[PDB]
Amino acid sequence: SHREIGLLNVSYDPTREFYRDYNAAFAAQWKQQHPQDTVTVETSHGGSGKQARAVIDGIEADVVTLALAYDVDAIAQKAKLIETDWEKRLPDNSAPYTSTIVFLVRKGNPKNIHDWPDLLRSGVAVVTPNPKTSGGARWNYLAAWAYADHIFKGDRERILRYMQALFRNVPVLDTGARGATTTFVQRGIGDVLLAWENEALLAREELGKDKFEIVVPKLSILAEPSVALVDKNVDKHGTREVAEAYLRYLYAPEGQKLAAKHFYRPRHPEFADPADIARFPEIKLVTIQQAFGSWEKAQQEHFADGGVFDQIQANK
Numbered sequence: 001s002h003r004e005i006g007l008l009n010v011s012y013d014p015t016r017e018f019y020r021d022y023n024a025a026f027a028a029q030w031k032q033q034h035p036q037d038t039v040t041v042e043t044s045h046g047g048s049g050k051q052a053r054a055v056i057d058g059i060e061a062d063v064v065t066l067a068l069a070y071d072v073d074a075i076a077q078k079a080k081l082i083e084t085d086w087e088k089r090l091p092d093n094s095a096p097y098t099s100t101i102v103f104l105v106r107k108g109n110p111k112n113i114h115d116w117p118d119l120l121r122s123g124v125a126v127v128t129p130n131p132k133t134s135g136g137a138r139w140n141y142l143a144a145w146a147y148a149d150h151i152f153k154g155d156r157e158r159i160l161r162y163m164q165a166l167f168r169n170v171p172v173l174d175t176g177a178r179g180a181t182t183t184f185v186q187r188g189i190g191d192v193l194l195a196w197e198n199e200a201l202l203a204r205e206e207l208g209k210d211k212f213e214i215v216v217p218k219l220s221i222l223a224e225p226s227v228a229l230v231d232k233n234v235d236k237h238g239t240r241e242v243a244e245a246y247l248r249y250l251y252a253p254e255g256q257k258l259a260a261k262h263f264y265r266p267r268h269p270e271f272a273d274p275a276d277i278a279r280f281p282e283i284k285l286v287t288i289q290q291a292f293g294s295w296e297k298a299q300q301e302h303f304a305d306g307g308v309f310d311q312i313q314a315n316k
Contacts, residue, residue, distance in 0.1 A: 002036035010061035013176035047176035048135030067135020127190035136177035164316035201263035
């Protein structure tokens with residue numbers, strides 16, 4: 001009838017399965033209450049940083065569902081497409097779910113990997129994506145740095161040597177985290193993947209507990225994937241109301257339930273299937289604010305061209 005509404009959600013890499021289900025659920029419940037409307041959502045996927053650059057360069061996303069807050073801030077700062085106070089518009093730092101970084105190892109854990117120091121041992125090959133393009137790659141790096149900061153009581157020279165030792169064991173840097181997962185799980189590269197927890201759980205469910213094992217390290221980071229309405233594009237497209245509802249329904253019971261089904265930790269687990277909640281192990285976590293002050297500080301120091309990651313790679 002009256003209206004066909006198209007939305008583009010520019011997302012990060014491993015959310016493919018989640019958004020296929022979520023988009024259908026959102027569209028169906030919208031049409032139930034608004035029978036003349038048909039909402040068609042397209043979701044694109046890639047490394048979070050590359051996806052953010054694509055929006056800046058003209059991909060007219062109505063919403064962004066990215067891996068971390070900096071990438072949304074960059075759209076707002078560098079392209080003015082999002083208002084700068086976006087992060088407070090939705091609850092929980094505009095992150096309706098969270099995740100963390102775990103290790104995925106092969107059956108039997110033949111290298112006996114249990115914690116961050118094992119990644120530095122001779123002959124261990126570590127798969128982790130490219131910090132210049134991937135958000136998970138940056139969470140992975142920051143988790144490693146936070147561990148080293150703890151054990152070395154903040155001594156920068158010792159942390160840098162530890163990071164160099166880690167990256168000497170990293171042979172390949174995939175553009176997006178789904179690429180990294182596939183490199184390890186399907187293409188047989190590496191002994192351990194530094195994984196989004198949702199990717200580790202999905203790999204174990206898809207291929208079997210008989211092929212891969214999740215190792216929970218003794219510290220990790222709270223990964224907060226940030227969502228935001230792209231003000232200038234929804235106003236250009238006439239999609240503001242539906243796009244707002246699309247993001248807000250991620251926080252509704254059905255969105256929270258679907259998040260847990262797809263191996264993301266909901267902010268409100270009371271709405272999820274208890275069997276899905278039971279899959280999430282206890283893990284000791286620092287946040288971005290605690291370990292690095294802010295995303296702005298972490299990104300500029302570590303991940304900007306010429307920054308610390310580039311220095312580690314050049315000096316290792």
